[PDB]
Amino acid sequence: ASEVPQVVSLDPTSIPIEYNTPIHDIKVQVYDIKGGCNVEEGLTIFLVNNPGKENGPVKISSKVNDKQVSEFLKDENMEKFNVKLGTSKHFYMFNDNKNSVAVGYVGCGSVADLSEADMKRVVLSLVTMLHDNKLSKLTVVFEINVDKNLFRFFLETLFYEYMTDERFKSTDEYIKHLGVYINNADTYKEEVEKARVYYFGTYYASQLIAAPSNYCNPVSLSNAAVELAQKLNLEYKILGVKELEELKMGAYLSVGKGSMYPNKFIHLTYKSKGDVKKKIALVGKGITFDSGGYNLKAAPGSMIDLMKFDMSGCAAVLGCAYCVGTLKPENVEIHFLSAVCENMVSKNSYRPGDIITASNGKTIEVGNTDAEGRLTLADALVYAEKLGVDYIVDIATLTGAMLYSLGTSYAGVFGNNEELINKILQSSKTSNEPVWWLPIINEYRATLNSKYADINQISSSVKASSIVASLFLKEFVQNTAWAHIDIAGVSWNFKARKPKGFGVRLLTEFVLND
Amino acid sequence: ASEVPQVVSLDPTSIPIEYNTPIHDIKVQVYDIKGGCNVEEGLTIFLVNNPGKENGPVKISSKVNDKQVSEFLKDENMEKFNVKLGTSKHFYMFNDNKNSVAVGYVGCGSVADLSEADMKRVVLSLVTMLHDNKLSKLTVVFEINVDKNLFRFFLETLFYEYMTDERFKSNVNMEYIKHLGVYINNADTYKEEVEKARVYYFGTYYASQLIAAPSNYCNPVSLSNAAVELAQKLNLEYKILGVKELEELKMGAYLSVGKGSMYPNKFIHLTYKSKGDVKKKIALVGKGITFDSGGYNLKAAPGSMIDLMKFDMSGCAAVLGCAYCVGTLKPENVEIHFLSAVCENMVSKNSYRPGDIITASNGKTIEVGNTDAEGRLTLADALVYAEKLGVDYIVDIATLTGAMLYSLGTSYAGVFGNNEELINKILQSSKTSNEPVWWLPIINEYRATLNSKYADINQISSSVKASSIVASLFLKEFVQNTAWAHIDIAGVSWNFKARKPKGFGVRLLTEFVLND
Amino acid sequence: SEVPQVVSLDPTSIPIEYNTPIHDIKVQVYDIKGGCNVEEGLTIFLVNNPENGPVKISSKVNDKQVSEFLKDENMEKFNVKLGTSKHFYMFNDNKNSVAVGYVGCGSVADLSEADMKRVVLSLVTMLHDNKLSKLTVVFEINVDKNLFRFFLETLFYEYMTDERFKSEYIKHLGVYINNADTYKEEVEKARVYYFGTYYASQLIAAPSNYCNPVSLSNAAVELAQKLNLEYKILGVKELEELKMGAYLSVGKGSMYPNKFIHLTYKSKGDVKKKIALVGKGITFDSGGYNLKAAPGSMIDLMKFDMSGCAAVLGCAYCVGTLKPENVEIHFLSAVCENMVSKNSYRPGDIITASNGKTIEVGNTDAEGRLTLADALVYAEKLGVDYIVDIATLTGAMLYSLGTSYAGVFGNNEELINKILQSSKTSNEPVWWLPIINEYRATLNSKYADINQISSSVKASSIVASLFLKEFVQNTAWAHIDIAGVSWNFKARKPKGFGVRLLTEFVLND
Ligand SMILES: O=C(NO)[C@H](NC(=O)[C@H]1[C@H]2C[C@@H]3C[C@@H](C[C@H]1C3)C2)c1ccc(-c2cc(F)c(F)c(F)c2)cc1
Ligand SMILES: O=C(NO)[C@H](NC(=O)[C@H]1[C@H]2C[C@@H]3C[C@@H](C[C@H]1C3)C2)c1ccc(-c2cc(F)c(F)c(F)c2)cc1
Ligand SMILES: O=C(NO)[C@H](NC(=O)[C@H]1[C@H]2C[C@@H]3C[C@@H](C[C@H]1C3)C2)c1ccc(-c2cc(F)c(F)c(F)c2)cc1
Ligand SMILES: [Zn+2]
Ligand SMILES: [Zn+2]
Ligand SMILES: [Zn+2]
């Protein structure tokens, strides 16, 4: 526990965090469709498609244990509506006990199996039916086929989108029950609490990312990490400047020199109770605010006002810690690392041109102070390898170029080991968090040859910034399977103006399958 | 009717126009709300507020002639929803006769007076519902207060927003209603607003069709042809002036702009004259640049949005849209001239150049400092021509300066003038048309920056950044002794959010003509 | 067709060299087993050391003079750092003046194509600086047959110098290598691949006033007749009848009429695979009214916007020369020029592709995908199994893959894998990038059926891919974006990237 420094007494000294969310009070009940659906209080929504027929008619296939509601939902009545992806309708009628009931459907399109992108659109339509309607219960009937992972993804996304983050509201009700009808209900029931765990890890990462830099700063973010570890029973260590100096983490320390906040290195650990068969280090980039430094983000479109999100990597990692500490995987040991700091303009800031020494002795010539993430990661990666692990995986909002390469939907993965990269890709598939393998092209290595230092921070000629950054990071892992997940493009949801909490599920699937 | 030149045979030779729209098929009935509501058919939507209570619950007061819908509308059920402006819900159910109806509402907030802006939000929320509706009838129940002019705005806005422009497409989820029912206090006073709204709608939709039509469809030849066709449908006098006539009139400023285009300049002159005695002569002048590249001052800078510059003939579109309304409604005692010097501003071996000195048809020489200030050049000759007609009032409408975006923005247009009475009359038309306009000064202190070293006058200023004022000072120099006002709609003409035209100006100009 | 001129001094053809000094080089491969003979010219040893360690030459040299020079103690003074070279003049046993030296091949045992390029360059440097009758190269390293072929191709290509616009070479090449007999058939394959690549380079390097739509399609014709390939040049009257409104719009502003190029190779005998190769052919890209005016848009490079076409024609030369079996190939290119005029198409214009789809033009500098849409409609009407297009399409490739790797997108995994397999055996490196369907919605025009560009999504190369995907209804299709990879910025010349890639793809299938 460290005291957060303030300039005035109105400066915040902690990150407000909501642990007990309304979502956590929702009772979930799954039923097999074979038994028929009961339509009573609340809203009962059918998820319906029509394979191959673009805007085909709605047909309700499930038995509804009610004569009135069954009559209403007959084919002749439904044929006037179509299944176009994301279309929806509210129905109102009285049931057999002369009570009023609300029914409806969401269109799931014409394709037999939904992509995670489509499912997200289905959820968004559903969440629209929940908003602006004081409901006590929602009931969802699956007339579409989903695999278990996508069933879980449906739940996680539902919980995440429905939830509203109101921590910073001053002057400006959720359902209590969720029923789900699906074929083979027993096979899906185990997905429900996993979805709840995954939702909050995701949502937790999002609260830290969305928290502005005056609230979420290196000291308060590491304070939150400690607090998280205590609630979860993880081991933790927070390295302050004095310890970091002794470890000679020159790269990391140089970046934070300019900040009124002292750097804090977060190290959480989860150990299994049984024999440890696999050791892992997860490393998240943790710049709580990235002004660019003396290479100030002043150019049009540099979006300096978004740079609270430059610790999204760290948040994904802490979010993953929540899931792993909760679900408690066996036969594994996990280190959660983040070299947290803040990149500022000051009389004490490191300068463009400065030559700095990393913790492994490699000297680095700084060409651009706005390329700070790779400096902090270099020391975090050296530290990580000294732990003696089997895999190192870093996750980071490293390069703007990711927006020109893969866009806002897929993250990019780089690495030095093919078996590790495929495992990341397998996690991508099962978490439904899209990731694409990109090359580390060695031909570009020579532009990192500094005239004076051992290595250039940046390339003066090569414009493929994501690859060059990966080449730089590679120099700081000597002998361990390593992968890099650049999330600079997928971290923020620009349409909805909120974080995605991207990566938490991806990392946790990786830990679990292993 | 002139022939449209083509580069290849696949180039279009006319602007497609929809004259008959499904809006024109909708039967409109207005009923008095004190009698309660019939809801046995179609879609019934209640417009409701909750004064004082921000985001307050929905309460429906009206008696309805169906027990089922009555139950649905009980306070216990309706209070699960709130009246946040724009928020809507609607449900399908079976009525007393076991027929399918739909019932819902649109929230109108917590304030008893709806702004025009607020009303557009309500209308948009309604239209969203209609775009997923296949029911034959829409019934709108006003449990809020509205006035005759606000109600007519609701109708015009509803019609325009409801109609979609599919001319360049090669729903399956909606269908256009055939009946629209309105329940409102004092139905009989509001009835006459209906066909007026239908007229104002089409004039506005017609302008929008011209504006949205891309510059390979909408060029000076095709636009002048369209105007001729319109004039013939309305029995208007018309004449289109070509290059040789324009040269004889010595329109050097306007002809300079068009030099670099493959399309010959065409000057549009339509006339409406009332059957009775003529007491007021008015000239309506619309800027008609069918595409604005900037010329040699090419629109290359960040934010110059060259891909939207098909809209630089928006002023032309509003004056032709006004001609529809006028020719249809036929006001008495007035003679109105609809003017536009139409051309295209391009980059060619033949284009005029930055620095060129040119001579306007009133003899004034002009030093061109920026070829992208070409609108004021075409207007200069159009203003001279209009003053020659011997009118009492000249009003120009034009997408003239980008600086409107920084002064009034996208909601309010700006009016400048040389005559207070005419300006006051414009501001009144703005009020009753619900097309907002704000009076800005012509500050004479800036005039000296237009003193060219070589020519009679400068086109632009080299110092003053208050563009909109400077361009007005330039225009003023081409109206000698007539009451004149200038409406700058550059900020206001396009609807960025909805990616379509507003057709701004049609109703404003028509109201000015009808109520003066 | 007659090339139009503004002034009498305007050129009316592309100068093309067919018979090059390279084709006059006698190439001979020997097995290292029976020692190496150092009798004339320059002898170069390719050596490594499995880090910047010392040069140790292992092969036996049948000359007392050269052997004492290559003695381990002398050579230790030199290191094997990749790309470094030394070479000394000396007199051999019979008082002949000979030159002996080495090129270091680093410390890793398996060289990438990138390292191999570095070996070849340092080797070519010496050839340029020395009047030699004969180069001998000794391989004391391990290479694939593919990598061996790559060595030659690169050697020839970099050795050759293009002096067509200006106002000596070895006559013999000796190669000593382990298992000589397995590498002998790679020699003339390499010679062919060299010229396919050098030919494409000549067209790319040719400035726009020499290489315009008329003169470029004239050259394709001249190439077709020399190889006896079926050919067909479609002109404006035909393109209009075919209703290619997107492609015709791009060229409306040019003084050179559009020319659509169609060449065909058919193997003698049973044909099992039909293929359409489509190259982007914009002979100069000014950008149109969306003028390349912004810093770093590099308008002076934009003669290179025809690299995809050149790639395809270079491939036609290789396929026309090697005559693979079981295949029918259609080499397509909608050639035109993108210019600023009174006749130019405008941003905001709505135009109609030959399949009926209307397109809203958001940016005239995205002209490539417009011409490609109409080419792809045309290609699919040919009834082929695969459509592969190659294009300098989006500048974003620079920021995703850079100047070394091209990106490939497509609608069929089996075809994409074939392209990737050809990438590895041609040693022209390509990387698979996704077509992300979630971005499709930003091509939903308010007025037309589809947008040419996105106003929101910044993943240009993918959006462009999504756009092209709409013009292939039912055929396996891939798209190779070579914008970042086409021009060699350090050598200030073209790479002619894609010729060998497309040919291996044809050959391996
Ligand atoms: O500062 C950064 N990481 O710590 C990173 N900057 C870079 O990639 C720049 C920096 C470092 C490099 C050398 C040069 C060009 C490139 C690579 C300056 C970066 C990260 C995200 C973004 C970014 C900007 C946005 F507007 C945006 F919407 C977004 F999602 C990401 C831009 C730059
Ligand atoms: O080109 C024009 N009229 O033909 C007009 N140009 C200007 O106002 C500029 C031109 C002409 C001037 C000298 C200098 C500054 C000012 C005045 C360049 C103008 C009008 C509208 C817009 C404009 C741009 C937008 F991106 C936009 F969204 C909009 F609604 C309007 C930009 C420039
Ligand atoms: O002109 C082009 N295709 O015909 C292409 N332009 C783009 O990708 C831009 C164009 C077209 C688009 C709309 C907007 C942003 C994007 C997409 C302008 C493009 C292609 C190559 C390059 C390019 C520029 C360089 F300086 C360079 F060295 C290079 F290798 C390629 C730049 C733009
Ligand atoms: Zn940075
Ligand atoms: Zn202009
Ligand atoms: Zn271009």
Chain B, residues 151-190, CB within 8 A of chain A, namely 172-173
Task: Identify which of B333, B340, B467 has the alpha carbon closest to the alpha carbon of residue B397.
Answer: B340
Neighbours of chain A (3+ CB pairs under 8 A): B, C
Inter-chain residue contact B90 with A90, CB threshold 8 Å? yes
Neighbours of chain C (3+ CB pairs under 8 A): A, B
CA of residue B18 relative to chain centroid, distance? 17
- Per the DSSP assignment, residues forming a β-bridge with C57 are none
Cα gap C189→C179, rounded to integer Å: 18
Q: Flag whether residue C294 sits within 8 Å of chain B, measured between CB atoms.
A: yes
Cα gap A296→A301, rounded to integer Å: 13
Ligand 3 centroid to Cα of residue C480, in Å, is 15
Domain boundary among A169, A196, A212: A212
Residue B444 forms part of a structural domain: yes
Shortest Cα–Cα distance, B152 to chain C (Å): 27
Q: Phi and psi for B145 in degrees, rounded to 5?
A: -90, 130
Task: Identify which of C219, C254, C256, C277 has the alpha carbon closest to the alpha carbon of residue C478.
Answer: C277
Task: Identify which of B514, B511, B498 has the alpha carbon closest to the alpha carbon of residue B204.
Answer: B511
Determine how many CB atoms are found less than 10 A away from the CB of residue C91.
11
Determine how many CB atoms are found less than 10 A away from the CB of residue A479.
7
Find the CATH number of the domain harbouring B105: 3.40.220.10
Q: Phi and psi for B49 in degrees, rounded to 5?
A: -120, 175
Inter-chain residue contact C112 with A443, CB threshold 8 Å? yes
Task: Identify which of A23, A36, A25 has the alpha carbon closest to the alpha carbon of residue A185.
Answer: A36
User: For chain C, what percentages of helix, strand and coil (3-state, to nearest 5) are there?
Assistant: 35, 20, 45
Cα gap B260→B25, rounded to integer Å: 45
Task: Identify which of B137, B382, B135 has the alpha carbon closest to the alpha carbon of residue B257.
Answer: B382
Ligand 6 centroid to Cα of residue C288, in Å, is 8
Of A59, A84, A297, A362, which is the active-site residue? A297
Cα gap B267→B249, rounded to integer Å: 12
Q: Is B419 exposed, middle or buried (0-12, 13-18, 19+ CB in 10 A)?
A: middle
Neighbours of chain B (3+ CB pairs under 8 A): A, C
Please state the atom number of ligand 3 nearest to the C-alpha of residue C296. 26
Please report which ligand is nearest the Cα atom of C369: 3
Return the half-sphere exposure (C-beta side, CA atoms, 13 A cut-off) of residue C267.
19
Contacts of A416 (CB under 8 A, 6+ apart): A440, A474, A477, A481, A482, A483
Residues B153 and B223 in one domain: no
- CB-CB contact of A387 with A377 (8 Å): no
Contacts of C10 (CB under 8 A, 6+ apart): C3, C209
Ligand 3 centroid to Cα of residue C287, in Å, is 9
Interface test with B, best of C299, C447, C452, C453 (most B CBs within 10 A): C447
Task: Identify which of B105, B106, B104, B109 has the alpha carbon closest to the alpha carbon of residue B53.
Answer: B109
**Which residue, by CA, sits nearest to atom 21 of ligand 1?**
A400
Q: How far is CA A340 from each of CA A160, A397, C4, rounded to the nearest angstrom?
A: 26, 13, 65
Cβ(C463) to ligand 3 under 6 A? no
Gap positions in chain C, given as the residue before each gap (C–N > 2.5 A)? Answer: 50, 167
Domain boundary among C184, C207, C230: C207
Q: Could you tell me the two tokens for A378? A: 């270099």
Inter-chain residue contact C352 with B212, CB threshold 8 Å? no
Evaluated on CA atoms B430, B431, B434, B437, the torsion sign reads positive
Please report which ligand is nearest the Cα atom of A310: 1
Inter-chain residue contact A102 with B91, CB threshold 8 Å? yes
Ligand 3 centroid to Cα of residue C418, in Å, is 28
Residues A98 and A238 in one domain: no
Domain boundary among A188, A212, A236: A212
Cβ(A371) to ligand 1 under 6 A? yes
Cα gap A341→A373, rounded to integer Å: 10
Helix axes C213-226, C186-205, angle to 10 degrees: 160
Taking every pair of Cα atoms in chain A, the longest distance, rounded to a whole number of angstroms, is 85
- CB-CB contact of C42 with C101 (8 Å): yes
Interface test with B, best of C291, C350, C455 (most B CBs within 10 A): C350
Q: Flag whether residue A466 sits within 8 Å of chain C, measured between CB atoms.
A: yes
- CB-CB contact of B426 with B485 (8 Å): yes
Residue B385 forms part of a structural domain: yes
- Per the DSSP assignment, residues forming a β-bridge with B64 are B37
Give the residue carrying structure tokens 């030559």. A355
Residues C321 and C338 in one domain: yes
Evaluated on CA atoms A102, A103, A107, A108, the torsion sign reads positive
Q: Which helix (H) or strand (E) holds A342?
A: strand A333-343
Query: For C348, which of B170, B307, B346 is closest by C-beta distance?
Result: B307
- CB-CB contact of B458 with B367 (8 Å): yes
Residue C4 forms part of a structural domain: no
- CB-CB contact of B345 with B293 (8 Å): yes
Q: Could you tell me the two tokens for A412? A: 């990019």
Shortest Cα–Cα distance, B113 to chain A (Å): 22
Contacts of B389 (CB under 8 A, 6+ apart): B281, B283, B337
Residue B13 forms part of a structural domain: no
- Residues touching ligand 2 (Cβ under 6 Å) are B 289, 292, 303-305, 312, 370, 372-375, 399, 401-403, 405, 460, 467, 490-491, 494
Q: How far is CA A161 from each of CA A206, A207, C396, rounded to the nearest angstrom?
A: 12, 13, 32
Q: Which segments of B201-245 are extended strands (E)?
A: 237-241
Determine how many CB atoms are found less than 10 A away from the CB of residue C508.
12
Strands of C42-47's sheet in order across: C26-31, C172-177, C134-139, C42-47, C97-104, C85-91
Pairing of strands C386-391, C273-279: parallel
Cα gap B372→B368, rounded to integer Å: 10
Contacts of A374 (CB under 8 A, 6+ apart): A398, A457, A469, A472, A473
Residue A192 forms part of a structural domain: yes
Cα gap B16→B212, rounded to integer Å: 11
Residue C296 forms part of a structural domain: yes
Contacts of B99 in chain A (CB under 8 A): none
Q: Flag whether residue A444 sits within 8 Å of chain C, measured between CB atoms.
A: yes
Cα gap A320→A316, rounded to integer Å: 6
- Residues C459, C460, C464, CA angle at the centre, nearest 5°? 125
What DSSP string runs through A368-428?
Answer: -TT--HHHHHHHHHHHHHHT--SEEEEEE---TTHHHHTTTT-EEEEES-HHHHHHHHHHH
Shortest Cα–Cα distance, A127 to chain B (Å): 14
CA-nearest residue of chain B to C449?
B169
Contacts of C457 in chain A (CB under 8 A): 407-408
Q: Flag whether residue C457 sits within 8 Å of chain A, measured between CB atoms.
A: yes
Q: Phi and psi for C418 in degrees, rounded to 5?
A: -60, -45
Task: Identify which of A288, A386, A293, A285 has the alpha carbon closest to the alpha carbon of residue A339.
Answer: A285
- Per the DSSP assignment, residues forming a β-bridge with C451 are C360
Residue C2 forms part of a structural domain: no
Q: CA dihedral defined by A129, A407, C285, C207, rounded to 10 degrees? A: -160
In residues, how long is chain C?
Answer: 509
Q: How far is CA C105 from each of CA C31, C134, C140, C143, C146, rounded to the nearest angstrom?
A: 20, 22, 10, 12, 17
3-state secondary structure of A267: strand
Query: For A117, which of C438, C458, C484 is closest by C-beta distance?
Result: C438
Strands of B365-367's sheet in order across: B357-359, B365-367, B457-458
CA of residue A108 relative to chain centroid, distance? 25
Q: Which amino acid is at B241?
A: L
Contacts of C322 (CB under 8 A, 6+ apart): C189, C192, C503, C507
Cα gap C148→C189, rounded to integer Å: 11
Residues C236 and C377 in one domain: yes
Cα gap A40→A36, rounded to integer Å: 13
Residues C276 and C301 in one domain: yes
Q: Which helix (H) or strand (E) holds A288?
A: strand A286-290
Structural domains in chain C (count):
2
The answer to the question of whether A370 is labelled as a binding residue is: yes
How far apart are the two ends of chain B, measured CA to CA in Å?
34
Residues A134 and A242 in one domain: no
Contacts of A164 (CB under 8 A, 6+ apart): none
3-state secondary structure of C136: strand
Q: Which segments of B407-493 are extended strands (E)?
A: 413-417, 437-439, 457-458, 483-488
Of A257, A374, A500, A505, which is the active-site residue? A374
CA of residue C17 relative to chain centroid, distance? 17
- CB-CB contact of C406 with C398 (8 Å): no
- CB-CB contact of B97 with A74 (8 Å): no
Rg, Å, chain C Cα set: 25
Evaluated on CA atoms A463, A466, A467, A468, the torsion sign reads positive
Residues B419 and B358 in one domain: yes
The answer to the question of whether C367 is labelled as a binding residue is: yes
Cα gap A214→C408, rounded to integer Å: 44
CA of residue B275 relative to chain centroid, distance? 28
**Which residue, by CA, sits nearest to atom 5 of ligand 3?**
C394
Task: Identify which of B200, B212, B217 has the alpha carbon closest to the alpha carbon of residue B149.
Answer: B200
Q: Flag whether residue A349 sits within 8 Å of chain C, measured between CB atoms.
A: no
Q: CA dihedral defined by A248, A252, A253, A255, rounded to 10 degrees? A: 150
Q: Which helix (H) or strand (E) holds A177?
A: strand A177-182
What DSSP string runs through C294-333?
Answer: STT--GGGGGGTTHHHHHHHHHHHHHHHH--SSEEEEEEE
CB < 8 Å & 24+ apart, contacts of A228-231: A228/A268, A228/A318, A228/A321, A228/A322, A229/A268, A229/A321, A229/A325, A231/A19
Residues C186 and C273 in one domain: no
Please state the atom number of ligand 3 nearest to the C-alpha of residue C394. 8
- CB-CB contact of A102 with A46 (8 Å): no
Task: Identify which of C271, C198, C166 has the alpha carbon closest to the alpha carbon of residue C17.
Answer: C198
Inter-chain residue contact A466 with C401, CB threshold 8 Å? no
Pairing of strands C350-352, C358-360: antiparallel
In residues, how long is chain A?
Answer: 514
Query: For C436, which of A401, A407, A439 is closest by C-beta distance?
Result: A407
- Per the DSSP assignment, residues forming a β-bridge with C30 are C176
- CB-CB contact of B315 with B396 (8 Å): yes
**Which residue, by CA, sits nearest to atom 4 of ligand 1?**
A373
- CB-CB contact of B235 with B328 (8 Å): no
H runs (alpha helix) in C179-282: 180-183, 186-205, 213-226, 236-241, 245-251
Determine how many CB atoms are found less than 10 A away from the CB of residue C441.
12
Cα gap C243→A481, rounded to integer Å: 56
How far apart are the two ends of chain C, measured CA to CA in Å?
36
Please state the atom number of ligand 3 nearest to the C-alpha of residue C489. 28
3-state secondary structure of C173: strand
User: What is the domain extent for residue B45?
Assistant: 20-214
Chain C, residues 218-247, CB within 8 A of chain B, namely 236, 240, 243, 245
Find the CATH number of the domain harbouring C389: 3.40.630.10
Residues B143 and B224 in one domain: no
Ligand 5 centroid to Cα of residue B503, in Å, is 20
Cα gap C487→C224, rounded to integer Å: 26
How far apart are the two ends of chain A, measured CA to CA in Å?
33
Q: Flag whether residue C357 sits within 8 Å of chain B, measured between CB atoms.
A: yes
Please state the atom number of ligand 1 nearest to the C-alpha of residue A303. 26
Residues C194 and C224 in one domain: no
**Which residue, by CA, sits nearest to atom 8 of ligand 1?**
A399
Q: Could you tell me the two tokens for A5? A: 């420094």
Q: Phi and psi for A422 in degrees, rounded to 5?
A: -70, -35
Residues B175 and B306 in one domain: no
Give the residue carrying structure tokens 């996690």. A427
Cα gap C380→C382, rounded to integer Å: 5
Inter-chain residue contact A405 with C460, CB threshold 8 Å? no
Ligand 4 centroid to Cα of residue A292, in Å, is 5
Q: Which segments of A132-232 are extended strands (E)?
A: 137-142, 177-182
What DSSP string runs through A118-144?
Answer: HHHHHHHHHHHHHTTS--SEEEEEE-S
Residue C8 forms part of a structural domain: no
Give the residue carrying structure tokens 């939902």. A73
Task: Identify which of C187, C462, C430, C474 has the alpha carbon closest to the alpha carbon of residue C311.
Answer: C430
The answer to the question of whether B372 is labelled as a binding residue is: yes
Report the structure determination method.
Answer: X-ray
Residues C387 and C264 in one domain: yes
- CB-CB contact of A151 with A70 (8 Å): no
